[PDB]
């Protein structure tokens, strides 16, 4: 009808609870975190959305997914087939690009197929294929009355007197030749010098352009073509040269293409893969970089790191013979006695004993191959994933010197459209692109060819343009990635689909998106909508929940405090119920209060000098220690690459010795100020169901050991892994301590569904028959956290570390809750959950990426008490937010990037959320200023009553 | 609404017609061979019913689709979802089986790895897998106060003394133990003898069935399986042995199995592939049937077919050393002298000088290998794909010695159900499966797991018995059907779907099925209809009309005569409309007249003796010529493998020193009586659109010949070459002479996009200058057969080959159209055409196979003049029927095998077609009688008058 009703849902924490959501209109679902948002529109509608569908595709697919678990829920009446829009559908899988999950790349393909001119490398002539048709017709363009001369090009400069040539021309019977640019007649004594080089263009026909003159041009094309193996000139009196030849190939030198095919452009095809690297157009050879973490470290102290406990006794050697010193800081070391030590002795002899692990000398007298070729040998002859991966350690990816790293054929890199090929147009970013295109002049038959792809190719870009993502290029592999710009291209992919009738469901589409480009998102998702379809979008965002039709409020609360429907209606009406506890924060009841006052900085600074990484143009910046700072700034303008990839990097190769490769920069001062950076990442907690809160934090190692010193353990001699997870001793061995059996589903993505022999209770039955205060391990581990501190509240131990996850802005989810199945924002704050109890020095710096991410307004005030208790206690909170609630609580702020992409990567401001509001280059305190003046005057109302 | 209406389609010969179709009910096309039932149902209604939804599968979809040519109709609404089933789309591509297509082999795999018991090879004990649970709970069944002892088997029958064991069971403190059946203390001074076995088993606890016992045993279990490394043995008192091991493994030699996956029983799948033939099943190696092709040939002219002009020489040079003589019948020599000419001397060195093709003399000194080594060496070691072909002529495929056929692995068929493992039951008949299924007995889990793959395994062989198709194997290769049989198998697959609102397109599913077995045809094809589905039938069939809802007649005549809706509604309202030219037939106005007389035998005979080829009893026949001969029967009898793997192949292999391998037979004599039998194949005519009927009659070949004497060829000096399809010198560059390019279509059948160079043609602009009475060489390439022999009345070999495929029945179709489209009923028919006119000698038998195939009756008519037309003239004429309209014209019937499968092949009745319709136990008599008697009686009642 013209609205779908769902009865009776219980996916986790819902309660049995019915709800309408209206019909192709912009549905958003709103409440605090873990209220039950995901169980219902993911857990529950998209499920059944989906499922409903694809068990109609065929039989089979009835009985494999018929035969599976179905959601929980009564009945659900008014569904569509349903797509999903999240970051659980997104490839983080190599050998993908942009360009090929957008399916932009495709219709690429498709365009230099369909118009594109192949040209000869070497001669750079559009190689041209003709019938013979095609060439009399041009030779027709020209005006009654035209004249040429036919000549078929038997021999083009080639040394040899050509005697056995001109006697058979001459044996058949012609006359006229042109030999080294002067014709002369056949049967004339004709002789040429042998080591001379030669032109000779026989001339076969001589024409007046008149009626019906077709096929005497034909017979004598014919003829001429026969004659130099189907290559002919046609030389024009008062203009120039023409030469045909007939099939993809060039006059000149033989080089042929054949036909233009989608598949010759494609590097997942051996039909337009490189030869050199098989279309992956990654190397993957020794970095330099690598191998000497610091360019100054003493050598007598393994400056070089894959040489480190043979080898050092190696060196000795290598030392002794060239008269490189020990005691070194490789900084000073002439360029010589490194390039032997790093590159060989190029068949020079050294001597080299060596004393083995036994005792024993041998000496012995090897042609020494230096520190580098030895990396490369040793991974490159191994056929262990081991020893490989012990190698690759010291590798990095360079770029296929054969295809300059664009995975195609050099013949498939000859064909250009607007002067460009494949690859630099792949190579552009989308505003480059798009640019491009609009600018891009055809033909009439070219653009007439290819006005459907050109369309498709434009609306595409200016959409992936739309939802914010106009500075990455094509060409970027899609693993490199985050998640909201994953999940925000699959969106825009989505959009280029145009389908209807379909229900989507969209998580969080503002994840990573600046308010600013805000009304965009917005924009585009009615466009979706206003497509006959009907969108349900999670989301926690204010302008998000304004601008929608209808909006849903779930659950009081999270967890078993929630799972039901507070609030539904419009947003103004939602606005005007005091049930609802996201009403109060948009109609101003409750907010988020902006501080009194904010921490002056002291005299401790950082002082990142000279970054110049991606985008970032020389920059230097000065990060105030002991206080909230917020990185802020558009999305491309390079805060991953500041904040990440060159001063995290950087602080922890100098405080943890970490090997990862920095970004480029000058230097970074202020390093004694502190002795450890906890970067609190985003990324996911464990890759398989074993990892969980309870593991990752510790927990479940304490909570073991009282099952072993229980009782009836005691008296049968269980201990701390009888009741371990992973252990064969007590664990389930049909799951093999899983719990959940991972199911195979080739299209749609894998489902885990319980393990029948333990039920998913993870253990066998008699190590679930050891009991502890009435419950077992496996209910336990079933057992929320809120719930476990309560039942933990005996062992302060456990309730320290439980406490930590309850604090968090969790403790609605359970211990044993496997990691695969865990939101990033959730893991990110399980992580939080490690880091937040430890005894501070004040001399530590946090590192936060869009800490936000899945959480309430309501939430989003407990984080900012916990992270502001960290700075209380002397520690350095730096936070990467668009999220305007967190920036303006901020002691200091500091702007990126007017715009993003290359119209970026510079600062824009820094200082005090007020010093950066009043900044009128930035968007950020563009969008800042009026939530400043707007919570101030909502504080001095509540003040002056 | 409630039925599809088609507006104004013009297809190939349709007029622009209008055509409502009723929704949901047994709709039945008829008409004239060519009137453009095919044209209207599948090249119109199909099409786009396929194409509007494939279409929506995607955009790229879409994309790929909306280029290409749509059907030529205005608008067609109505439609639904459309699937066509007839050959066009059935597989003969190898590696697949019966089972694979009807998909009940897949399900075959399911139900094994669910209920499958999997045994060890050499045990033969049901291996089983274990957590301790299952374990502990089966020790409990036995009643309460039941006893026992366990016994950890540390050794099984090991010689050595175990002096190293005994020690360390009493260094850890164990004290019962069991060895050599008696059962010892430790610490009494045990010694064992070297030389003898010892069975060692440790003797862990012991104790009484009571309550609450499960952790105590739990316990000794864990410590008993600790102990023999997974293996225990539970010795009961009162009864014998139980023994666990968990995991998939054998507790007596080790071997496993892991886990039951359906994949495990798949042979495309290395996970299920025999591994010395990689799941293929066959072998290919040299039959010792093909190197001789008759057992008595003069060695000195060649009796070994593979040497036959070196060779010539070596043979003389064996034969010289071992004594054996050069002028011989084959059959007379001792078997030693074959021997070692076949099969190498075994290392002793033959002396052997040959002279070279040159003339020089060479002397060597070589170890003989023999001449099936030789081919089999040659063969193997040559990487080229033309002397691979030369040797596999010499070869035949055998069964894997490995595998014993079954393409799975030795583990794999470990795994059996009904004491019966997958291949076993694979290899069964559809009857013999079903009866194996109805008679399987099972246990409650083993049911309640598999009832809905057992019910939908029934039901699909039920299907397949349906259809007419229970005689036929799940393990029969897909290549080796017939046409009828592979589009029943379809129309079986596709009742087993239960799809509904689907548009089914049936073209003429009676083929090749008996008479008697059509009320099961139209009983199932109802019951798909009454399944909420809408079939549009192509049939000729008197019954399948007569049982129709609705029923359209199209076209007055064939070609440019037709492609008209004559009338339309049910088949008693065509039924009394004197314009249906099918109406007179079924009313009775005009039939198929039986003979006044019928051509009594003369005194020559065919004499088949001991045919025991497939299901053949040991069958001895003897066949009239100069006669009109039908060999009938229900389908299984085995009628192709008697005429055409028996007969056929011996005739020719004598006849015409053919040189396939006979059907397994003691003799056939009368083969005097012949000069050459041609068998008229139902096989396509060519495999590339480059064949087509003016190709395959050889009229093309005089067709080159006239426009290469032509005033402008002769001046253009263009040969019967020019004008030539295949030769580059006119034909269109672009299509390489094919004047369609194939469009790659994935998981679509393939589709042909006109050469937009040519825009079909064949030939270039100027080839085509080129005329012949005001039609150039495309012009008359597509003219109709018809129109054809009336534009050449000219020349008079032209025409005496054109009136040959008018004659035929066709004539309706044209000159040019590619042999990839033509029917396989058409394609016979243009075979007919070249056999049609020759000067018949008396001497020669025509074999035909259903020739009736995809026509009317009407059309039955002329091409029965025809072929006896051919008896006529002295010839004989074999005919494998169904068809009773033919079977009544026949002089003489052949019946073979009551009922199908094992049950048959063997002669039912012989004689004139009264004198079978007197024979109660032939199903074709008791079909035959009332027809006789039926249309006897219709000339009475026209003679009277
Ligand atoms: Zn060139
Ligand atoms: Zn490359
Ligand atoms: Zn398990
Ligand atoms: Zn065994
Ligand atoms: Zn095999
Ligand atoms: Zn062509």
Redesign the pocket.
Same mark, same amino acid.
């Given at each position: 009808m013209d609205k779908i009703i769902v009865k009776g849902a219980r996916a986790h924490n819902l309660k049995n609870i019915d709800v309408e959501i209206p019909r192709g209109k912009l549905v958003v679902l709103t409440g605090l975190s873990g209220s039950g948002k995901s169980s219902l529109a993911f857990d529950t509608i998209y499920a059944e959305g989906q499922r409903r569908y694809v068990e109609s595709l065929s039989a089979y697919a009835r009985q494999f997914l018929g035969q599976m678990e179905k959601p929980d829920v009564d009945a659900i009446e008014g569904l569509s087939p349903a797509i999903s829009i999240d970051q659980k559908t997104t490839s983080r899988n190599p050998r993908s690009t942009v360009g090929t999950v957008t399916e932009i790349y495709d219709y690429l393909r498709l365009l230099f197929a369909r118009i594109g001119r192949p040209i %000869?490398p070497?001669?750079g002539?559009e190689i041209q294929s003709q019938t013979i048709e095609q060439m009399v017709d041009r030779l027709l363009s020209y005006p009654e009355r035209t004249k040429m001369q036919i000549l078929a090009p038997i021999v083009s400069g080639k040394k040899g007197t050509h005697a056995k040539t001109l006697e058979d021309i001459r044996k058949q019977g012609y006359v006229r030749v042109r030999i080294d640019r002067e014709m002369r007649e056949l049967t004339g004594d004709i002789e040429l010098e042998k080591n001379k080089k030669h032109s000779i263009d026989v001339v076969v026909d001589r024409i007046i352009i008149k009626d019906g003159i077709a096929a005497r041009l034909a017979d004598s094309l014919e003829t001429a073509l026969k004659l130099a193996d189907g290559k002919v000139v046609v030389d024009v009196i008062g203009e120039g040269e023409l030469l045909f030849s007939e099939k993809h190939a060039?006059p000149? %030198?033989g080089?042929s293409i054949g036909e233009l095919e989608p598949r010759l452009f494609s590097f997942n095809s051996p039909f337009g893969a490189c030869p050199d690297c098989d279309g992956l157009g990654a190397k993957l050879e020794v970095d330099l970089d690598l191998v000497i973490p610091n360019d100054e470290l003493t050598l007598k102290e393994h400056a070089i790191a894959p040489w480190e406990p043979y080898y050092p006794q190696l060196l000795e050697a290598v030392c002794r013979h060239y008269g490189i010193p020990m005691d070194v800081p490789v900084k000073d070391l002439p360029k010589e006695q490194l390039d032997k030590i790093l590159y060989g002795s190029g068949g020079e002899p050294i001597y080299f004993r060596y004393t083995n692990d036994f005792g024993q000398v041998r000496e012995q007298y090897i042609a020494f191959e230096g520190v580098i070729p030895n990396v490369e040998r040793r991974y490159r002859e191994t056929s262990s994933d081991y020893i490989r991966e012990q190698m690759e350690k010291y590798m990095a990816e360079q770029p296929c010197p054969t295809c300059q790293g664009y995975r195609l054929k050099k013949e498939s890199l000859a064909v250009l459209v607007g002067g460009k090929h494949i690859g630099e147009v792949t190579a552009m970013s989308v505003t480059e692109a798009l640019a491009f295109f609009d600018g891009l002049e055809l033909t009439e038959k070219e653009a007439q060819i290819a006005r459907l792809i050109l369309r498709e190719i434009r609306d595409r870009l200016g959409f992936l343009q739309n939802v914010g993502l106009d500075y990455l290029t094509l060409s970027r592999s899609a693993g490199t990635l985050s998640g909201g710009e994953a999940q925000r291209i699959r969106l825009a992919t989505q959009i280029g689909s145009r389908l209807t009738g379909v229900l989507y469901v969209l998580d969080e589409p503002s994840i990573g998106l600046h308010q600013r480009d805000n009304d965009r998102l917005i924009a585009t998702l009615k466009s979706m909508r206003d497509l006959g379809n009907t969108l349900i979008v999670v989301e926690h965002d204010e302008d998000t929940m304004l601008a929608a039709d209808y909006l849903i409020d779930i659950g009081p609360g999270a967890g078993i405090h929630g799972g039901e429907v507070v609030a539904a209606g419009t947003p103004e009406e939602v606005m005007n119920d005091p049930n609802s506890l996201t009403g109060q924060y948009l109609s101003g009841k409750k907010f988020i209060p902006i501080p009194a006052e904010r921490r002056r900085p002291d005299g401790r600074w950082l002082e990142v000098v000279g970054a110049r990484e991606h985008n970032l143009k020389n920059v230097s910046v000065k990060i105030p220690l002991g206080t909230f700072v917020a990185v802020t700034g558009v999305s491309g303008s390079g805060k991953s690459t500041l904040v990440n990839e060159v001063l995290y990097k950087a602080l922890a190769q100098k405080l943890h010795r970490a090997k990862a490769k920095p970004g480029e920069h000058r230097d970074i001062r202020g390093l004694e100020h502190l002795d450890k950076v906890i970067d609190i990442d985003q990324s996911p907690i464990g890759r398989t169901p074993r990892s969980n809160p309870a593991t990752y934090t510790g927990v479940f190692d304490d909570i073991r050991d009282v099952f072993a010193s229980t009782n009836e353990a005691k008296v049968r001699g269980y201990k701390k892994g009888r009741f371990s997870f992973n252990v064969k001793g007590g664990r389930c061995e049909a799951c093999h301590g899983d719990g959940i059996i991972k199911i195979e589903m080739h299209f749609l993505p894998d489902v885990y569904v319980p393990c029948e022999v333990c039920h998913g209770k993870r253990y066998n039955r008699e190590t679930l028959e050891v009991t502890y205060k009435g419950k077992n391990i496996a209910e336990v581990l079933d057992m929320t956290v809120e719930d476990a501190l309560d039942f933990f509240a005996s062992i302060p131990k456990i309730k320290r570390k439980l406490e930590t996850l309850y604090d968090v802005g969790l403790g609605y989810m359970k211990l044993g809750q496997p990691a695969t199945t865990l939101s990033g924002g959730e893991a990110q704050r399980v992580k939080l959950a490690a880091e937040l109890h430890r005894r501070s020095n004040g001399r530590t710096l946090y590192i936060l990426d869009e800490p936000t991410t899945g959480l309430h307004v309501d939430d989003i005030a407990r984080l900012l008490d916990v992270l502001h208790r960290l700075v209380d206690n002397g520690d350095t909170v730096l936070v990467i937010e668009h999220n305007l609630d967190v920036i303006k609580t901020a002691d200091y702020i500091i702007d990126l990037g007017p715009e993003g992409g290359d119209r970026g990567g510079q600062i824009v401001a820094v200082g005090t959320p007020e010093e950066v509001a009043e900044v009128k280059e930035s968007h950020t305190g563009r969008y800042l200023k009026p939530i400043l003046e707007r919570d101030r005057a909502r504080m001095q109302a509540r003040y002056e009553a």
């Amino acid at each position: 009808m013209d609205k779908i009703i769902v009865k009776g849902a219980r996916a986790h924490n819902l309660k049995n609870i019915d709800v309408e959501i209206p019909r192709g209109k912009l549905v958003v679902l709103t409440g605090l975190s873990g209220s039950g948002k995901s169980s219902l529109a993911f857990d529950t509608i998209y499920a059944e959305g989906q499922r409903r569908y694809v068990e109609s595709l065929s039989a089979y697919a009835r009985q494999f997914l018929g035969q599976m678990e179905k959601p929980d829920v009564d009945a659900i009446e008014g569904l569509s087939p349903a797509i999903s829009i999240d970051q659980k559908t997104t490839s983080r899988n190599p050998r993908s690009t942009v360009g090929t999950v957008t399916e932009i790349y495709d219709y690429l393909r498709l365009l230099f197929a369909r118009i594109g001119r192949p040209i %000869c490398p070497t001669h750079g002539i559009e190689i041209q294929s003709q019938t013979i048709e095609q060439m009399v017709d041009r030779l027709l363009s020209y005006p009654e009355r035209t004249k040429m001369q036919i000549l078929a090009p038997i021999v083009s400069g080639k040394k040899g007197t050509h005697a056995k040539t001109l006697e058979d021309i001459r044996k058949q019977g012609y006359v006229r030749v042109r030999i080294d640019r002067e014709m002369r007649e056949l049967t004339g004594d004709i002789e040429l010098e042998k080591n001379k080089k030669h032109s000779i263009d026989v001339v076969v026909d001589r024409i007046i352009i008149k009626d019906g003159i077709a096929a005497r041009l034909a017979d004598s094309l014919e003829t001429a073509l026969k004659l130099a193996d189907g290559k002919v000139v046609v030389d024009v009196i008062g203009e120039g040269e023409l030469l045909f030849s007939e099939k993809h190939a060039c006059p000149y %030198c033989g080089f042929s293409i054949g036909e233009l095919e989608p598949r010759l452009f494609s590097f997942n095809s051996p039909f337009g893969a490189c030869p050199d690297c098989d279309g992956l157009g990654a190397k993957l050879e020794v970095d330099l970089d690598l191998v000497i973490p610091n360019d100054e470290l003493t050598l007598k102290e393994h400056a070089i790191a894959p040489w480190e406990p043979y080898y050092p006794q190696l060196l000795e050697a290598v030392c002794r013979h060239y008269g490189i010193p020990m005691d070194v800081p490789v900084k000073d070391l002439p360029k010589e006695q490194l390039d032997k030590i790093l590159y060989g002795s190029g068949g020079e002899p050294i001597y080299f004993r060596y004393t083995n692990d036994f005792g024993q000398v041998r000496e012995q007298y090897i042609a020494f191959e230096g520190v580098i070729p030895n990396v490369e040998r040793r991974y490159r002859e191994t056929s262990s994933d081991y020893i490989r991966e012990q190698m690759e350690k010291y590798m990095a990816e360079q770029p296929c010197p054969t295809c300059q790293g664009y995975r195609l054929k050099k013949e498939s890199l000859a064909v250009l459209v607007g002067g460009k090929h494949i690859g630099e147009v792949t190579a552009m970013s989308v505003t480059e692109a798009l640019a491009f295109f609009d600018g891009l002049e055809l033909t009439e038959k070219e653009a007439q060819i290819a006005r459907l792809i050109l369309r498709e190719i434009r609306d595409r870009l200016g959409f992936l343009q739309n939802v914010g993502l106009d500075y990455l290029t094509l060409s970027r592999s899609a693993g490199t990635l985050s998640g909201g710009e994953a999940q925000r291209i699959r969106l825009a992919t989505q959009i280029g689909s145009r389908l209807t009738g379909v229900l989507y469901v969209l998580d969080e589409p503002s994840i990573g998106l600046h308010q600013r480009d805000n009304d965009r998102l917005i924009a585009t998702l009615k466009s979706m909508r206003d497509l006959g379809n009907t969108l349900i979008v999670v989301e926690h965002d204010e302008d998000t929940m304004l601008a929608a039709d209808y909006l849903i409020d779930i659950g009081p609360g999270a967890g078993i405090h929630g799972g039901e429907v507070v609030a539904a209606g419009t947003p103004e009406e939602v606005m005007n119920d005091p049930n609802s506890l996201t009403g109060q924060y948009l109609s101003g009841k409750k907010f988020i209060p902006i501080p009194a006052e904010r921490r002056r900085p002291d005299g401790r600074w950082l002082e990142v000098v000279g970054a110049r990484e991606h985008n970032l143009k020389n920059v230097s910046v000065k990060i105030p220690l002991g206080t909230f700072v917020a990185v802020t700034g558009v999305s491309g303008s390079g805060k991953s690459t500041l904040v990440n990839e060159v001063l995290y990097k950087a602080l922890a190769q100098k405080l943890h010795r970490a090997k990862a490769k920095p970004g480029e920069h000058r230097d970074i001062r202020g390093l004694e100020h502190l002795d450890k950076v906890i970067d609190i990442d985003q990324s996911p907690i464990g890759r398989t169901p074993r990892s969980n809160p309870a593991t990752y934090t510790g927990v479940f190692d304490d909570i073991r050991d009282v099952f072993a010193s229980t009782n009836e353990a005691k008296v049968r001699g269980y201990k701390k892994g009888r009741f371990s997870f992973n252990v064969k001793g007590g664990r389930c061995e049909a799951c093999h301590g899983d719990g959940i059996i991972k199911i195979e589903m080739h299209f749609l993505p894998d489902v885990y569904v319980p393990c029948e022999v333990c039920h998913g209770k993870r253990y066998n039955r008699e190590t679930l028959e050891v009991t502890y205060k009435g419950k077992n391990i496996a209910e336990v581990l079933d057992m929320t956290v809120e719930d476990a501190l309560d039942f933990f509240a005996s062992i302060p131990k456990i309730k320290r570390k439980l406490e930590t996850l309850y604090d968090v802005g969790l403790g609605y989810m359970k211990l044993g809750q496997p990691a695969t199945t865990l939101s990033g924002g959730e893991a990110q704050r399980v992580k939080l959950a490690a880091e937040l109890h430890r005894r501070s020095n004040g001399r530590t710096l946090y590192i936060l990426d869009e800490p936000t991410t899945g959480l309430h307004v309501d939430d989003i005030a407990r984080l900012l008490d916990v992270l502001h208790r960290l700075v209380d206690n002397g520690d350095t909170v730096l936070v990467i937010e668009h999220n305007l609630d967190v920036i303006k609580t901020a002691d200091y702020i500091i702007d990126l990037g007017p715009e993003g992409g290359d119209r970026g990567g510079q600062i824009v401001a820094v200082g005090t959320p007020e010093e950066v509001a009043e900044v009128k280059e930035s968007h950020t305190g563009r969008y800042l200023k009026p939530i400043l003046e707007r919570d101030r005057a909502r504080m001095q109302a509540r003040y002056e009553a």
